[PDB]
Symmetry: none
Subunit: 29 residues, 10 copies
């Protein structure tokens, strides 16, 4: 009705369900 | 009705369900 | 009605359900 | 009615249900 | 009705379900 | 002398000198 | 002398001097 | 002398001097 | 002298001096 | 002298000085 707009997000936005590692160092030095 | 707008977020926004590690160091030194 | 707007958040916003670790160091030194 | 706006938050905002650790150090030194 | 538009997102947007590693170093030095 | 081992930590171990914040929510609702 | 081992840590081990934030939510709702 | 081993760490091991953020949500809803 | 080994780390090992962010969501909804 | 080995690391090993981001979502919904 006179320029109406709707946006539907049926799922998650920006979700994490696994692993996020910024830095990983391993050694047997 | 005269430029109406609706936004629906059916899920989580910016949710964490796993693991977030910024830094991980391991050693057997 | 004359430029009305509604926003719906059906889920959590910025929620944590897992683990968030900033720093993790392990050693057998 | 003449530029009305409503925002709905059906869930938690900024909630923690898991573990948040800032720093974690372990050793067998 | 007079230039109406709708956008549907039936799935997740920007979700992670695996592993994201920024940096990974390993050594037997 | 017959399997002698020494470990020296010249600095702090698992210490905080900055800011550690677990959760932060801000709004201008 | 007969399998002697020494380990020297001249710096901090697993220490924080910056900012560690677990979760941050901001809005101008 | 008969299998002697020494390990020297002149710097920090697994330390943070910058910013580590686990999750960040921002909006102008 | 009879299989002697030395390892020298002149710098930081697994340290952060910049920014590590696990997840970021921004919107002008 | 009888199989002597030395390893020298003049710089950082597995360190971050820039930006590491795991996930980023932005929108003008």
């Amino acid at each position: 009705v006179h320029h109406q707009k709707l946006v539907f997000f049926a799922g998650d936005v920006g979700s994490n369900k696994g692993a996020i590692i910024g830095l990983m160092v391993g050694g047997v030095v």
